[PDB]
Every structure is written in C-alpha cells, then in structure tokens.
Design a protein around this ligand. Structure first.
Ligand SMILES: [Ca+2]
Ligand code: NA
Length: 621
C-alpha cells in the first residue's frame, strides 16, 4: 500500500538546523533523553525541572498552577517564568535548553477558567466554513498565549464512523473530505501560514491528534480496535493528516486505539514507515496520556518499544522520573539506538527553536504575554457566536413555526434551558463537565439568557421553567433538552435511543403538546441520536450540537428581530448522517445501503416549506 508524500510546503530553515546539530553534538545521553520526557504540573516541581531540564511539561487541565482552581494571568506567567528559568539553569544537568509548556485545546483554551468556549467540532463541521475554522485557530492561539503557553493540541482530525463512540463530538464529520478541508485551516490558524509569519508572534506550536484510526474502532469503543485494511486507514482515517502535514503542523499525537489488534503507540509501521517515511512528516510525535503503558512489554515507568516505534516525546505525567532513568539505561544497554534518540531530539528541537525559544524573552516578558484580555476576549466571543449560528441544523420546521416573533409570549423549558454545562459539554473547564455550574463560565450566556435578552428588547414576555410550569399560557414553548456532558469512554453508548432508560424529556414534550402549545425543540448532543419519538412531539426541531459559551447564537437564528423580520437564517448542514432506526450504528455517506432519516448534507432553512410527517416509533427487540 502506497501512501502519498504530503509534506510539500514547509522547507527546513538552515539556521535552525545548524543550531540543532551544534546542540546535539555536545549533549549527553542524559540530556537528550530529558528532552523527550514530559511531566505534568500536578506532579512536577520546579526543583525537578532544575535537576533534569525536561524538554516540555504539560498543563493537564485538572489544576491551575500552584494548585489554584482559578488564577490571574500574573500567576500563570509567574509559574511559566519559574519553569523557564529552572530549565535555563545549567546547574545540576549541565545545559541550558529552554523548556515549553503544552496544553490540550479541544474547543478553545478549554481547560482554563475564563476561556472562550467555541462549539465542539461536530457543529463546526455542520457550519461548512473553512475561513471560520482558521479564525477560530487564530483566536485560540491568542487565548493560549495569554496563559504563557507555547504549545497547544489542535486540531482533532478523527473521522468518526460509529456514533456510539464517546468522542464523536470531537470530530468535524463522518466524511474524510470535510475533515481534509478543515484540518489545514486550523493548523495555519494556530501556527500561521507557511512563510514569513510561520510560528511568529502570538502563533503557537500545534499538535494534530490523533494518528490514527481512533474514529474507526469496532462498535465505537473508546481506545478500541480498528478493523480495516491499510487502504481504508489511508483513504478514510488519514485525510485530516494530509492537509495538516502539508500545512506544516509541528507535532502529531499518536492514538490510544489498536489497528487490527496492535496498539498504534507500539507500531513502527504506522509511526515511522507511514507517518515519517511515506507521508514525509518532518515534525515530532508526542504520545497520549500514559498511552505507553498499554504497549506489549511496557509499563508506566518504561517503554522502549514506543520510542523505537517512532514516538519522540513521551507524555508521562506522573511517572516521569523513573521513566527518565529507565530510558537512559536502555539507551546505554543498546536497546534504544542513539540514532533514534538523536532523531527524536532533532524533530522536537526543530519545533522549539523555529518557534523561538532561544530568541524570545522569558514568558512574562514576551509581547504575546502583555494582553490578558485575549483570554475570553469580546472579539472572540463574537466569533464564537457566529460559529454557533452557523452550526445549527434545522431538522424539522412544520408550518414554519420558526422563526418566532420576538414580541411573543414564550416559555423556555427543559433541563438544558439555563444550563451552560450542558451546552458546553465535556472538556470545558473540567473533564466530564458533570460538576460545572453556570458560575464556572464567567461571561458565557445560557440559551435562556440569550432568548430573554432579545425578547425583552422586542417587548415580548418570557418565562423560564425547566419542568414546563406556567402561569400565562405561552404562544410557543422552546424546549432545550439533550445529552449530559461527557468525555472519552464515559460517553460510549450501546443504544442509539435518546434517554432510552427514562424518556424524561419526551414526557415534558408530550405534556406541552397535550396542552396544545406549539413546541420548538433545541437538542444539545455530541452526535445524532435516534429521536423519532421526540421529533413527533415537536413542531420544530433543531440540532444545536454542543455550542459552547455563546448561547445567544441560538436566539439570533430562532427569533425574529424587533420588527418581526428574520435576522439570521439557518445555514448549517449535517456533517454526520441522522439515523431512522435505533440500530443504524454505522450509517455513513457513500454506504452501499444508505437509508438515513436525514442525509449527510441535509438542513432546512426558512426559505423551505417542507413538513416532516409523523415517524415510526418502533424500536428493535
Ligand atoms: Ca455516520
Ligand atoms: Na537545563
């Protein structure tokens, strides 16, 4: 199987390469290995950084620096300075190579309190807007820079084929063509375009995740087994990497899944022969969180096989010290070649040096560190609100009930009506999102709050009641319902029916319908789900995905302006096929037998006059 060479734009900088060779020539085995190890701040001390001079360290997201839950910019920058100076202290370890701080950036700088939260990828995919993606990358780079961090993990280029996976919402589309179109835009948004501005100023080092096939696991099991021939791995699951590598992405993260029974992190064919030799990726490979422990023969404290397979930087958040000493002994034992550690360090230094770790000042003194307002900037929330508007997909709008006159009397109901944690989903300040409350999102706007602001301005009347209680009978009920927030395997499911165990939202919808109140359903989810029953109980139904912090984007489209005219029409179109039956687990565009309820590319607008009939509510045995 032949893979195409896709590193066609980025040319090496001879000055940078000169510096790498001079450094390598004088470094000890110990110093080289230190560059390859990445501790996490929950476990790392400044003293350990001084002693070892690790090449990077991770903002894992579970705590702010110094243990704070929330921290001023000055506090982030103080922590960054301390680590930077400890690394530049050549005492103890014998060299002065600046370290860098890295962070995951799932939908903005989303581990961080106060960050703008953009819609998760599935909704961005619905938007079909490459320019939007690039601008989101640019905004994200600034918000990351505002915390003193040089390196962010984004884009996520999974191509998801089975929506049972709990990470489905992290994917732009089931369609590789769409992911390919997007991936390079996010990379250049973050890093800058190849050329004079490459990696300059507020631009960050980027990592494209995850290589490869994590969206193709059997039954959508998280970290499961991807059963597909190599041509399929190339043509379906690698499309995002073609454009990300072509745009010069500096880092690639290896994936937790297996391919035909073998863990990717231990697969030299994938991580070296395919990624580096055939595709031509010239940057560095980073592993995922303790992913090395799952490779055959490896454990938390040792994994020569992953290194030998082509991993260049090991994400070992807690066991880094023992991992360090073991790896050094393995190089000395000859079971990890010096040529291999040399190549790992070359690729990693290539990123740090070209970004400018030797030429820029300490973190707190850098120009991109002088703008605390970048974190959650008004301009970025305006961008996110645009993304929200464009992400919404109108599935049903019977008798053109939408858009609703802003001057009407409206009831807003449903568990998601005023719950920012549900609209944001997982990877939002916290991992699962379960414990988030509205106060964890300063300057965000709930869906109710957005509607209320516009209805009040238009002289209408609005009421919030999750359970649908009212005093004055409304002209219409907007009911906001959906999945609870989740991340990773917590979100893996076996059944496609929404709330199959309780049907709590359905009871609410039927209650309102029984009172002859017109119902507009706003559905929050990380994926299409089987919702025929809820659709039947709705006059209109909107797939809003996981819109993030800017909930007023929903009001912008659903409501008229004050004069009663349309302000924004729907523009979004499905990037994942919507199931007609509760057992349509792998429903994908181009499938031989393709029978979706609503196809890839479907999405109504106010210009349509289409009614959706009552649908079958039969479920499988
Ligand atoms: Ca699909
Ligand atoms: Na050092």
């Amino acid at each position: 199987v032949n893979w195409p060479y896709v590193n066609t734009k980025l040319k090496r900088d001879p000055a940078v390469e000169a510096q790498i060779e001079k450094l390598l020539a004088k470094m000890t085995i110990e110093q080289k290995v230190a560059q390859m190890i990445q501790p996490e701040i929950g476990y790392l001390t400044v003293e350990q950084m001084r002693k070892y001079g690790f090449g990077s360290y991770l903002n894992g997201g579970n705590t702010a620096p110094y243990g704070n839950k929330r921290a001023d910019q000055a506090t982030w920058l103080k922590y960054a300075d301390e680590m930077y100076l400890a690394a530049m202290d050549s005492t103890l370890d014998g060299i002065a190579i600046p370290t860098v701080w890295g962070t995951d950036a799932m939908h903005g700088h989303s581990n961080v309190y106060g960050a703008t939260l953009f819609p998760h990828n599935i909704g961005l995919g619905a938007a079909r807007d490459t320019d939007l993606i690039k601008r989101i990358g640019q905004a994200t780079a600034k918000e990351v820079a505002a915390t003193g961090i040089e390196w962010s993990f984004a884009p996520t280029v999974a191509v998801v084929r089975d929506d049972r996976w709990g990470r489905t919402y992290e994917s732009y589309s089931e369609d590789p063509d769409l992911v390919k179109r997007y991936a390079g835009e996010m990379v250049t948004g973050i890093q800058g375009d190849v050329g004079a501005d490459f990696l300059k100023g507020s631009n960050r080092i980027a990592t494209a995740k995850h290589f490869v096939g994590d969206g193709g696991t059997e039954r959508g099991v998280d970290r499961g087994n991807t059963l597909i021939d190599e041509k399929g791995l190339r043509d379906i699951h690698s499309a995002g990497y073609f454009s990300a590598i072509n745009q010069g992405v500096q880092s690639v993260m290896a994936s937790f899944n297996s391919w035909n029974g073998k863990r990717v992190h231990g697969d030299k064919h994938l991580l070296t022969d395919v990624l580096k030799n055939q595709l031509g990726f010239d940057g560095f490979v980073v592993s995922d969180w303790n992913a090395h422990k799952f490779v055959e023969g490896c454990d938390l404290e040792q994994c020569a096989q992953a290194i030998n397979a082509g991993v260049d930087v090991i994400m070992v958040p807690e066991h880094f010290e023992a991992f360090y000493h073991n790896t050094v002994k393995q190089v000395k034992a000859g079971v990890i070649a010096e040529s291999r550690i040399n190549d790992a360090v070359r690729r990693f230094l290539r990123a740090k040096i070209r970004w400018g770790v030797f030429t820029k000042s300490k973190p707190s003194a850098r120009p991109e560190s002088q703008h605390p307002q970048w974190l959650g900037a008004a301009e970025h929330r305006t961008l996110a609100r645009e993304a929200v508007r464009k992400s919404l997909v109108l599935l049903k709008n019977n008798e053109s009930i939408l858009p609703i006159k802003a001057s009407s009397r409206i009831l807003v109901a449903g568990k998601g009506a005023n719950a920012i944690n549900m609209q944001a989903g997982g990877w939002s300040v916290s991992w699962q999102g379960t414990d988030n409350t509205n106060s964890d999102f300063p300057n965000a706007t709930s869906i109710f709050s957005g509607l209320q602001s516009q209805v009040t301005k238009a002289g209408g009347k609005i009421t919030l009641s999750e359970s649908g209680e009212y005093t004055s009978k409304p002209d219409v009920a907007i009911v906001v319902i959906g999945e609870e927030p989740y991340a990773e395997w917590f979100g893996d499911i076996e059944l496609l029916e929404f709330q199959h165990e309780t049907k709590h939202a359905l009871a609410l919808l039927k209650q309102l319908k029984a009172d002859n109140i017109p119902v507009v359903t706003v559905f929050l989810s990380g994926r299409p789900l089987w919702v025929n029953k809820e659709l039947n109980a709705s006059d209109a139904f909107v797939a809003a995905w996981l819109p993030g912090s800017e909930g007023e984007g929903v009001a912008d489209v659903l409501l008229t302006n004050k004069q009663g005219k349309t302000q924004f029409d729907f523009t979004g179109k499905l990037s994942f096929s919507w199931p007609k039956y509760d057992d349509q687990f792998t429903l994908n565009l181009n499938d031989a037998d393709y029978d979706p309820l609503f196809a890839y590319g479907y999405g109504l607008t106010y210009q349509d006059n289409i009614n959706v009939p009552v649908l079958s509510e039969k479920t499988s045995p």
